[PDB]
Amino acid sequence: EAMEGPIPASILRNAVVVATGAWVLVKLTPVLSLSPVALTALLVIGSVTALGGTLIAIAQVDIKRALSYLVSAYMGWVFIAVGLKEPGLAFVFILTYSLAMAVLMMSIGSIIWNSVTQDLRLLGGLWSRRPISGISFLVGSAGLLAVPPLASFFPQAELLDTAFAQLPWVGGVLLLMNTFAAFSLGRTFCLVWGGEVKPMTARSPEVFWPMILPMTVDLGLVLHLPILMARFDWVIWTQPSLATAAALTITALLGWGVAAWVYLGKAIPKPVQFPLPSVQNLLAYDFYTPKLYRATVVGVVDMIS
Amino acid sequence: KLPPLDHPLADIIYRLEAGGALIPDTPVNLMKIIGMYKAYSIPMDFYWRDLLYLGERVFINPFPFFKYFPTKEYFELPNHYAGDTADLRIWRGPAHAHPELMEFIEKGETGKMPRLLHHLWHDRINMEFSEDLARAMMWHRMGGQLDIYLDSEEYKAAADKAIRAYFKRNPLMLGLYKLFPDLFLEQARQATYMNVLGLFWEVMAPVFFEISDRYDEGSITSVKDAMNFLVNGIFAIAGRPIYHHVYIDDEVHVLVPKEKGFMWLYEAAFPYVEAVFYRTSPFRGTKSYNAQANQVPTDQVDFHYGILFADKFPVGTAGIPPTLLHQDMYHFLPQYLKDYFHQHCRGEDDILVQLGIAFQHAMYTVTSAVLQATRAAFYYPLDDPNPEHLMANRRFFVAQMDRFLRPQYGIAEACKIRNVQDPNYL
Amino acid sequence: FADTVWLIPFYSLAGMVLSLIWSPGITRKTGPRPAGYLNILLTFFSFVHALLATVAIA
Amino acid sequence: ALLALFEGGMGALVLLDSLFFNYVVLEILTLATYLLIGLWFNQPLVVTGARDAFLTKRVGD
Amino acid sequence: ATIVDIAVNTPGFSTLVTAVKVANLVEALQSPGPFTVFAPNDDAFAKLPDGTITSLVQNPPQLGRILKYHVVAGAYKATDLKRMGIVTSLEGSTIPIHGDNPLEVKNATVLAADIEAENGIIHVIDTVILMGLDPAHSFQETNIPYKV
Numbered sequence: 001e002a003m004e005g006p007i008p009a010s011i012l013r014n015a016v017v018v019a020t021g022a023w024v025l026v027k028l029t030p031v032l033s034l035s036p037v038a039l040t041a042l043l044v045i046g047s048v049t050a051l052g053g054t055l056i057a058i059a060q061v062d063i064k065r066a067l068s069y070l071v072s073a074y075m076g077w078v079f080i081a082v083g084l085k086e087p088g089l090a091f092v093f094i095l096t097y098s099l100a101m102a103v104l105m106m107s108i109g110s111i112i113w114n115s116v117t118q119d120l121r122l123l124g125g126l127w128s129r130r131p132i133s134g135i136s137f138l139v140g141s142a143g144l145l146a147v148p149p150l151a152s153f154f155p156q157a158e159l160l161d162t163a164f165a166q167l168p169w170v171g172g173v174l175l176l177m178n179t180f181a182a183f184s185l186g187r188t189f190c191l192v193w194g195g196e197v198k199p200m201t202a203r204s205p206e207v208f209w210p211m212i213l214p215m216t217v218d219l220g221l222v223l224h225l226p227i228l229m230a231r232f233d234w235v236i237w238t239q240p241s242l243a244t245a246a247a248l249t250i251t252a253l254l255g256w257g258v259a260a261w262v263y264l265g266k267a268i269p270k271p272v273q274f275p276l277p278s279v280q281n282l283l284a285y286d287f288y289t290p291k292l293y294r295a296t297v298v299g300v301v302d303m304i305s
Numbered sequence: 306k307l308p309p310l311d312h313p314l315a316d317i318i319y320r321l322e323a324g325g326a327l328i329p330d331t332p333v334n335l336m337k338i339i340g341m342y343k344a345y346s347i348p349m350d351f352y353w354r355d356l357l358y359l360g361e362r363v364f365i366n367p368f369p370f371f372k373y374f375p376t377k378e379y380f381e382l383p384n385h386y387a388g389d390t391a392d393l394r395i396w397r398g399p400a401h402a403h404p405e406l407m408e409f410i411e412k413g414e415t416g417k418m419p420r421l422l423h424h425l426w427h428d429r430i431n432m433e434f435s436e437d438l439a440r441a442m443m444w445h446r447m448g449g450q451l452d453i454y455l456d457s458e459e460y461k462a463a464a465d466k467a468i469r470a471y472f473k474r475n476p477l478m479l480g481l482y483k484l485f486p487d488l489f490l491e492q493a494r495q496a497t498y499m500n501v502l503g504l505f506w507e508v509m510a511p512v513f514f515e516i517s518d519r520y521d522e523g524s525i526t527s528v529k530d531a532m533n534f535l536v537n538g539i540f541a542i543a544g545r546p547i548y549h550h551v552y553i554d555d556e557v558h559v560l561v562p563k564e565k566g567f568m569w570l571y572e573a574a575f576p577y578v579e580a581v582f583y584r585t586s587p588f589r590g591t592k593s594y595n596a597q598a599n600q601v602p603t604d605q606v607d608f609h610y611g612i613l614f615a616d617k618f619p620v621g622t623a624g625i626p627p628t629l630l631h632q633d634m635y636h637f638l639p640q641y642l643k644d645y646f647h648q649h650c651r652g653e654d655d656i657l658v659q660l661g662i663a664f665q666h667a668m669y670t671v672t673s674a675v676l677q678a679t680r681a682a683f684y685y686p687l688d689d690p691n692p693e694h695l696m697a698n699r700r701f702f703v704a705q706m707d708r709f710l711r712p713q714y715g716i717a718e719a720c721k722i723r724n725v726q727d728p729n730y731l
Numbered sequence: 732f733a734d735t736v737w738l739i740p741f742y743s744l745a746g747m748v749l750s751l752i753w754s755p756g757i758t759r760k761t762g763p764r765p766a767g768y769l770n771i772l773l774t775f776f777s778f779v780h781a782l783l784a785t786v787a788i789a
Numbered sequence: 790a791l792l793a794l795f796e797g798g799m800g801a802l803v804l805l806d807s808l809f810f811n812y813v814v815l816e817i818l819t820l821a822t823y824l825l826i827g828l829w830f831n832q833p834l835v836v837t838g839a840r841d842a843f844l845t846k847r848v849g850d
Numbered sequence: 851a852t853i854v855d856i857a858v859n860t861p862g863f864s865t866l867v868t869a870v871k872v873a874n875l876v877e878a879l880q881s882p883g884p885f886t887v888f889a890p891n892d893d894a895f896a897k898l899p900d901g902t903i904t905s906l907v908q909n910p911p912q913l914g915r916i917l918k919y920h921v922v923a924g925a926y927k928a929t930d931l932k933r934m935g936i937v938t939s940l941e942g943s944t945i946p947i948h949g950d951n952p953l954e955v956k957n958a959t960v961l962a963a964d965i966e967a968e969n970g971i972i973h974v975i976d977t978v979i980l981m982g983l984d985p986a987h988s989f990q991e992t993n994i995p996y997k998v
């Protein structure tokens with residue numbers, strides 16, 4: 001519900017959510033290390049919110065709410081990392097994730113500003129007539145999951161090696177979190193920039209100079225991050241072990257590819273229905289979290305009041 | 306001449322059938338109307354010049370940093386009809402600019418400063434509201450019959466030639482146009498819609514100039530006479546052409562030709578009344594674009610966010626576009642309206658809110674003039690003896706009032722009419 | 732620099748008091764733009780300061 | 790002004806390394822989030838989103 | 851020529867012929883094809899603010915578009931038009947022709963229908979004409995049916 005008011009959303013989901021609680025949680029690593037129960041609870045919360053955020057972001061129709069659940073998921077990733085007594089990985093990943101999500105939110109805001117709807121079901125062919133806002137989204141996508149060239153790969157590589165050295169099942173989430181989160185962005189690109197053009201976006205002029213300057217200037221930072229960690233030897237993942245470096249990329253590319261096939265394939269009805277209809281409208285309403293709140297806490301605190 | 310039928314809005318139809326006046330016809334109701342026309346005409350007189358500047362000289366500028374500084378000669382650009390070398394000669398006054406607008410450009414609200422410094426310190430004419438309208442006519446497709454022409458095989462070729470001639474200096478842009486030829490081709494279409502809207506306000510600015518002078522002399526005595534002057538001016542200019550004519554270095558590129566047969570009524574007046582008076586893509590600080598909360602419609606036919614449906618008490622607050630015009634339409638106020646507002650609710654403090662309510666009143670008579678012109682063009686006059694020829698007019702008015710009642714998304718719980726008929730709405 | 736980097740949270744805290752000079756009930760004339768402009772100025776000056784402080788603590 | 794009160798709060802949060810003053814600003818930013826989401830309060834789904842965004846984020850803090 | 855000279859010689863039609871001469875419909879409207887056409891007859895032009903005609907005459911193409919809308923390809927008579935009810939003109943059209951004793955074109959009434967000519971039937975009406983709106987792009991509710 002904090003997706004009311006665009007571009008604090010480009011800064012809140014990107015500069016507040018990333019370094020407000022995660023910053024407090026990381027600098028508390030010495031204290032949280034004292035009890036090996038807070039750490040396992042930390043792993044549980046992070047993994048649960050990661051899986052839930054990815055699965056819910058896949059089942060959204062509002063472009064502005066199909067990225068905030070991904071914010072929840074990639075902050076759960078930081079919860080996981082800090083759960084493995086790895087504060088350095090969290091401090092490194094915050095930077096890359098923040099850059100990428102800034103590009104993503106600015107591109108989505110640019111699309112919204114001129115294409116009034118936010119319904120994914122009402123936006124269509126924009127690639128041919130709107131390149132920058134599309135390539136920026138694509139680069140912000142690649143700089144979040146995979147493409148070892150782009151910089152978010154490095155910090156999510158050590159957290160595979162570390163989660164495999166100890167407590168392997170956690171890695172099984174981190175790997176899986178890399179395909180669902182890739183299927184969401186995929187269906188958010190293949191719905192806003194690919195496909196047949198629709199009434200609401202029949203005449204989409206590209207935006208003016210002040211909305212695509214930061215977006216393109218922030219699209220450069222993401223492309224230089226990988227090379228900015230080469231000039232100055234800031235090695236993040238010491239042992240290469242390409243056996244695991246070839247896993248994240250395969251997972252992400254597979255997710256994004258299935259996403260592109262389902263939506264750019266015209267081999268399926270476009271308002272896609274799930275074989276189980278009851279779970280589609282359950283991920284779409286975030287597990288009915290409001291009906292949960294108004295039942296457990298509010299309903300109590302109100303009643304006794 | 307006909308029986309009373311059923312409507313809850315019937316009290317208004319009996320007024321439309323018998324003369325006009327979509328709003329009541331009291332003298333205090335017309336003083337504010339003419340004052341609002343006089344106040345809305347001078348920023349409009351800058352708008353129609355700056356939009357032409359955008360459509361011809363800033364055709365597709367990646368960095369149109371200035372973009373609101375028309376050249377010295379676009380304030381000398383002869384308004385096609387206000388003076389001696391006029392085309393239909395309404396508004397007797399000078400045909401180059403307005404002394405009041407030139408004064409505001411010169412001194413602003415602080416003092417005689419360079420124009421760039423008048424822009425940084427806001428002190429401006431809030432030109433962003435005219436661009437928002439131009440971008441609101443597009444994306445609704447409501448351009449008229451040239452939108453279907455604005456597609457291919459005559460426009461894409463002319464736009465290609467114009468673009469290749471515009472960027473010929475820097476090969477960076479030229480190369481970009483080669484990769485994505487539809488990137489600057491959709492920005493060309495935008496300049497075309499800017500030109501269309503700027504050509505619509507080259508007609509309404511003289512009309513709103515001359516109506517205030519008619520009221521000053523005393524020829525305007527009731528709202529009926531005001532809307533009748535509006536209808537006569539509408540029919541008088543219904544044939545003027547529409548074109549683009551992008552000017553590049555020592556060259557003009559005929560983008561949409563005069564020989565295509567696009568006229569002012571069917572390509573800039575009717576597609577404008579529906580776009581800005583009716584549709585006007587939803588306010589950002591009044592409705593939630595949230596796709597799950599079915600609040601904003603899915604089809605563009607049910608966009609009830611125009612000036613006729615607007616909510617003018619939250620004016621001057623965050624997330625509400627029309628404020629940009631009411632601050633723009635505030636310092637060009639005649640004295641008999643400043644005195645009328647200063648003795649009222651909150652005095653000269655909330656002057657923007659009542660100044661916007663009066664603007665709503667004025668635009669109601671403008672759209673009523675559009676309704677009367679529409680029926681006089683496509684239907685039968687009021688002085689018709691036949692009964693079927695009078696039932697046709699009644700059906701048309703009932704249809705056009707049903708647009709004010711459709712309860713799809715509170716479209717009936719918006720629609721400021723039956724609220725403008727109230728004397729205590731101001 | 733790098734010895735006065737603790738002044739960074741004040742630059743913006745100086746823009747959060749000055750930008751309110753332009754709220755619609757205070758100016759009532761020519762309002763809405765230099766607030767954002769001066770906030771951008773303050774943010775740029777606080778970014779330059781931070782970049783210099785980072786270079787100085789290599 | 791609210792965007793400037795985040796840029797200041799963010800700096801004060803990353804500079805100060807006391808668990809106590811890392812909560813002071815952490816709550817000031819909760820208040821700032823309440824007023825920032827509720828920017829255009831004439832929308833009935835913002836005054837409901839800003840309510841949750843302040844209460845949910847306040848209980849944790 | 852044929853339709854032109856017929857409009858010139860016997861009846862008044864003193865402002866239609868000049869309107870056509872201003873446009874380039876003199877070469878057309880006489881080439882061999884029926885294209886039945888009706889005329890406002892100097893009084894439909896009278897029930898119009900004169901600024902209308904003074905602005906249309908200065909712009910040949912727009913007046914030409916209107917006059918093309920007056921022209922309807924094909925050869926039809928009052929019975930044919932009553933049977934059809936809707937007929938396409940040049941530049942496309944709807945032209946909801948109606949009426950029972952006098953054939954009522956969109957919002958006019960015929961005066962002298964079935965005026966034979968060399969290459970086309972000619973009708974005479976009392977309101978001028980104006981094109982539809984295509985509610986997908988222009989103003990919305992202006993296609994109210996005339997008869998029930």
Ligand SMILES: CCCCCCCCCCCCCCCC(=O)OC[C@H](CO[C@@H]1O[C@H](CS(=O)(=O)O)[C@@H](O)[C@H](O)[C@H]1O)OC(=O)CCCCCCCCCCCCCCC
Nearest residue numbers: 058059060179180183254257258261270271272280283284
């Ligand atoms: C080692 C093997 C690697 C394989 C890895 C597999 C990873 C798959 C990615 C994860 C799938 C996510 C499941 C959750 C979906 C969900 O809960 O909601 C379903 C959402 C609902 O969106 C709905 O959208 C609807 C409109 S629209 O469709 O979005 O336009 C709207 O009505 C509705 O409200 C909205 O919620 O829609 C979907 O995304 C459905 C996705 C399921 C499609 C999978 C089919 C498999 C195809 C076979 C592969 C083809 C071969 C190609 C080879 C390259």
Ligand SMILES: CC1=C(/C=C/C(C)=C/C=C/C(C)=C/C=C/C=C(C)/C=C/C=C(C)/C=C/C2=C(C)CCCC2(C)C)C(C)(C)CCC1
Nearest residue numbers: 132206207208209212213216217220221224227228231367
């Ligand atoms: C407006 C627009 C456009 C265009 C735009 C553009 C073209 C932009 C560009 C942009 C750009 C072009 C950007 C760039 C950027 C870059 C960057 C941002 C960089 C950075 C770098 C860095 C940061 C580096 C670093 C380093 C090095 C390398 C050296 C030393 C240091 C180290 C690291 C440390 C057009 C026409 C389409 C139209 C529409 C829109």
Ligand SMILES: [Zn+2]
Nearest residue numbers: 371373424425
């Ligand atoms: Zn400016």
